[PDB]
């Protein structure tokens, strides 16, 4: 490494994977952490939460009209009333996408995203492409994801700048006649409740 | 801070990786989970972050070609190494040390220890979460509806006011209430809550540009000045 | 664009590595020298581009992360194998295979070529240079000491309207005179040139500090407007 | 490489290094280039080229009154009599440093410096921290060169955003009296011309 040019030089990604055994080892031997309590974090994150959890309150909203009524006047309320509610979710709206009105979800300057109800973000959510450019040509990234809005719908973008939480809720699709709550949940995919992504009829 | 993080309204980082969600992997290294692990269960005491203003900044500090190249995971194992060693929690030579050891014996063991009741607290919590709604004897500088005109102002520190949202006429959408506020709270400088607001803007004030798109941004009350 | 290219204003990047100027070495790696060969040898003869304009838009174009870790003779490289390739110079893939023959067998002799003729062209164009001085009919629309705004455009192309200056209030420096105007030129549509402007502007404006410091920036006229 | 995050993954320098020789290489076959034209380049910009073309202007217009006026008024006349012109040296402006006006040089965009009277740039003239700083904290970027402006002197940043490009002209230091014009040249350092130093008295 040239002295001049260290900038050049990332560090490695076996380098987080030591720091983050170090610091494990330095927390643990120092009694601030311990082996059961990182393996409490990593479940609840990886298997109890999920994007289930919005899809039942979609399927909800779908199957009982009071419901979606009191979701869309005071969410907060009555997603804590669910047990929807925790670290990163202690104040989350839902937005209504309507024919003429498309919404999408961002957190520009990070990666923002309502974990006890959708769990962890996707992939893409977090990397600086979506991040970057949905804010500014919000048509054109959605494209990328399969949905080519007309020209006549407008989009809404709702950039997560502070720990407010924004969840969409999608149209019901064609085709679901009869469908009871539990089977339209099924359908109701993350992506949706992201905005990315329209519901396909079944 | 007008960091490599705020990206928004950049050209130049291509095409989403398209991924459909059944397929779309959580993890794949056990390191991942363990940043994690970390973030949480420091968080919960109160080690080095007591919310997530202190949690972003760090990420922030990053140098800009570790940001862009560490992996998601390792903006976290990041920001837990910074505000450990700025509070005073870990020794950076020791941690320097100890990261040498694992870069060179990645099979090192790893010391293991059971305690059910700081279990209980990590799950609290996970459930009680960390509201930064708080109240203040003031009254909103701004009413819904209000036509506002955000700042030109440069804060060295954090800040969660986009660049791309500055200086910019945009409309009152709702008074959510007082929030502690991230520029001051993120640096240890107190709660000190001010009115948050949302605030909506048309793409052709944010770009010049001529399409029926908006965004909806929060901002705090000093981020804004009336017309 | 507004991309990694246009640093102007951001923070994180860190201290500035001083080194003594009889200390700071040109070209540490043969390729480094071999880069400087090849912009000037193309452009001399008009190969992939015909002046800077050209020459900017490929560097600006590379990835990020590349940007950012190439070294700068690697935009260089970066920027002569697009133009190349995009103007049908070269082939995509028999490059593509080229690179790979001397990644895996770096000491693979390069052919030899003697073109004296060539030679004598290549110092011409090292000594005559490529000045974008043009005339136009049309008037100057600004005059020296006129308060303008920059406009808020968001060019996807490339510009030279750093970000920085955006939406900003500037007094006129000097009228130029008409130069080939970039954001056609860098893309081979047309020369078009504008007049170009020397415009001051204060720290107060750009950046709400308080200091005695100001920055003049070269500005097409149609990056601005009258107010 | 994870398909999600190819970009992650930068171009080793090696990867330049191979396609430089390729370029080379195909060029060199193609008819488009030969070895000696190569060679002359890298001779003009490593060798012929330099700093000590701007250090005997400085020179000259301490030792030349009537040269200095000229010069101040009309650079790019000056400068092409005197031969010191050529790409990216078409247009070349000076400015004059005085008690209470310090003037800095950059190119935020990218690089852009007079080859033809300075040679190539610093490194660090190239590198983002510089680029992206001096616009905005100048006095603490030169802080970081050994430059503490007193906060009554004014500074003025010149960024080369165009095909103009901006020469400083340093003010001559005490200890200097009764030294020839070469011998001035001799303690005009590049930095000087840029903006990022004073002249030292010798
Ligand atoms: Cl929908
Ligand atoms: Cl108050
Ligand atoms: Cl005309
Ligand atoms: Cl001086
Ligand atoms: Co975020
Ligand atoms: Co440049």
Same mark, same amino acid.
């Given at each position: 490494?040239?002295?001049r040019?260290?900038?050049?030089?990332?560090?490695?990604?076996?380098?987080?994977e030591?720091?983050?055994?170090? @610091?494990?080892?330095?927390?643990?031997?120092k009694?601030?952490?311990?082996?059961? $309590?990182?393996?409490?974090?990593?479940?609840?994150?990886?298997?109890?939460?999920?994007?289930?959890?919005?899809?039942?309150?979609?399927?909800?909203?779908?199957?009982?009209?009071?419901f979606?009524?009191?979701?869309?006047?005071?969410?907060?309320?009555?997603?804590?009333?669910?047990?929807?509610?925790?670290?990163?979710?202690?104040? =989350?709206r839902?937005?209504?996408?309507?024919?003429?009105?498309?919404?999408?979800?961002?957190?520009?300057?990070?990666?923002?995203?309502?974990?006890?109800?959708?769990? @962890?973000?996707?992939?893409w959510?977090?990397?600086?492409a979506?991040?970057?450019? *949905?804010?500014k040509?919000?048509?054109? *990234?959605?494209?990328?994801?399969?949905?080519?809005?007309?020209?006549?719908?407008? =989009?809404?973008?709702?950039?997560?700048?502070?720990?407010?939480?924004?969840?969409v809720?999608?149209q019901?699709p064609?085709?679901?006649?009869?469908?009871?709550?539990?089977?339209? $949940?099924?359908?109701?995919?993350?992506?949706?409740?992201?905005?990315?992504?329209?519901?396909?009829?079944? | 801070?007008?960091?490599?993080?705020?990206?928004?309204?950049?050209?130049?980082?291509?095409?989403?990786?398209?991924?459909?969600?059944e397929?779309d992997?959580?993890?794949?290294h056990?390191?991942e989970?363990?940043?994690?692990?970390? *973030? %949480?269960?420091?968080? %919960?005491?109160?080690?080095?972050?007591?919310?997530?203003?202190?949690?972003?900044?760090? =990420?922030?500090?990053?140098?800009?070609?570790?940001?862009?190249?560490?992996?998601?995971?390792?903006?976290?194992? %990041?920001?837990?190494?910074?505000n450990?060693?700025?509070?005073?929690?870990?020794?950076?030579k020791?941690?320097?040390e100890r990261?040498?050891?694992f870069?060179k014996?990645?099979?090192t063991?790893?010391?293991?220890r059971?305690?059910?009741?700081?279990?209980?607290?990590?799950?609290?919590?996970?459930?009680?979460? @960390?509201?930064?709604?708080?109240?203040?004897?003031?009254?909103?500088?701004?009413?819904?509806?209000?036509?506002?005109?955000?700042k030109?102002?440069?804060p060295?520190?954090?800040?969660?006011?986009?660049?791309?949202?500055?200086?910019?006429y945009?409309?009152?959408?709702?008074?959510?209430?007082?929030?502690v506020?991230?520029?001051? %709270?993120?640096?240890?400088?107190?709660?000190?809550?001010?009115?948050?607001?949302?605030?909506?803007?048309?793409?052709?004030?944010?770009?010049?540009?001529k399409?029926?798109?908006?965004?909806?941004?929060?901002?705090?009350?000093s981020?804004?000045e009336?017309?």
């Open positions: 490494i040239d002295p040019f260290p900038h050049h030089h990332p560090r490695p990604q076996s380098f987080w030591a720091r983050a055994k170090a @610091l494990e080892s330095l927390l643990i031997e009694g601030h952490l311990s082996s059961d $309590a990182i393996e409490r974090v990593i479940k609840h994150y990886e298997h109890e939460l999920g994007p289930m959890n919005g899809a039942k309150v979609v399927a909800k909203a779908w199957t009982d009209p009071a979606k009524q009191r979701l869309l006047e005071d969410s907060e309320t009555v997603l804590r009333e669910l047990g929807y509610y925790g670290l990163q979710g202690e104040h =989350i839902v937005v209504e996408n309507t024919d003429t009105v498309h919404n999408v979800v961002v957190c520009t300057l990070c990666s923002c995203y309502p974990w006890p109800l959708l769990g @962890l973000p996707p992939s959510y977090k990397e600086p979506y991040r970057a450019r *949905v804010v040509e919000p048509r054109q *990234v959605l494209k990328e994801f399969g949905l080519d809005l007309p020209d006549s719908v407008e =989009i809404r973008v709702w950039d997560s700048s502070s720990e407010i939480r924004f969840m809720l999608p019901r064609e085709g679901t006649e009869g469908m009871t709550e539990e089977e339209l $949940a099924k359908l109701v995919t993350r992506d949706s409740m992201i905005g990315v992504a329209k519901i396909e009829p079944p | 801070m007008n960091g490599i993080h705020d990206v928004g309204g950049m050209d130049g980082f291509g095409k989403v990786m398209y991924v459909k969600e397929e992997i959580y993890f794949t056990d390191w989970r363990l940043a994690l692990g970390l *973030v %949480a269960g420091c968080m %919960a005491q109160g080690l080095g972050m007591k919310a997530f203003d202190e949690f972003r900044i760090g =990420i922030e500090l990053m140098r800009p070609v570790d940001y862009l190249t560490s992996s998601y995971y390792g903006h976290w194992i %990041a920001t837990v190494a910074y450990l060693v700025d509070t005073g929690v870990l020794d950076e020791e941690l320097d990261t040498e050891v870069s014996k990645p099979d063991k790893i010391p293991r059971e305690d059910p009741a700081l279990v209980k607290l990590v799950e609290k919590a996970l459930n009680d979460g @960390l509201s930064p709604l708080r109240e203040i004897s003031a009254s909103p500088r701004f009413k819904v509806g209000e036509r506002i005109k955000t030109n102002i440069h060295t520190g954090h800040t969660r006011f986009p660049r791309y949202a500055r200086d910019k945009g409309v009152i959408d709702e008074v959510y209430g007082a929030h506020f991230p520029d001051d %709270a993120a640096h240890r400088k107190g709660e000190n809550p001010q009115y948050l607001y949302r605030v909506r803007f048309e793409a052709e004030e944010l770009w010049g540009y399409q029926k798109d908006s965004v909806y941004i929060d901002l705090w009350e981020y804004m009336p017309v």
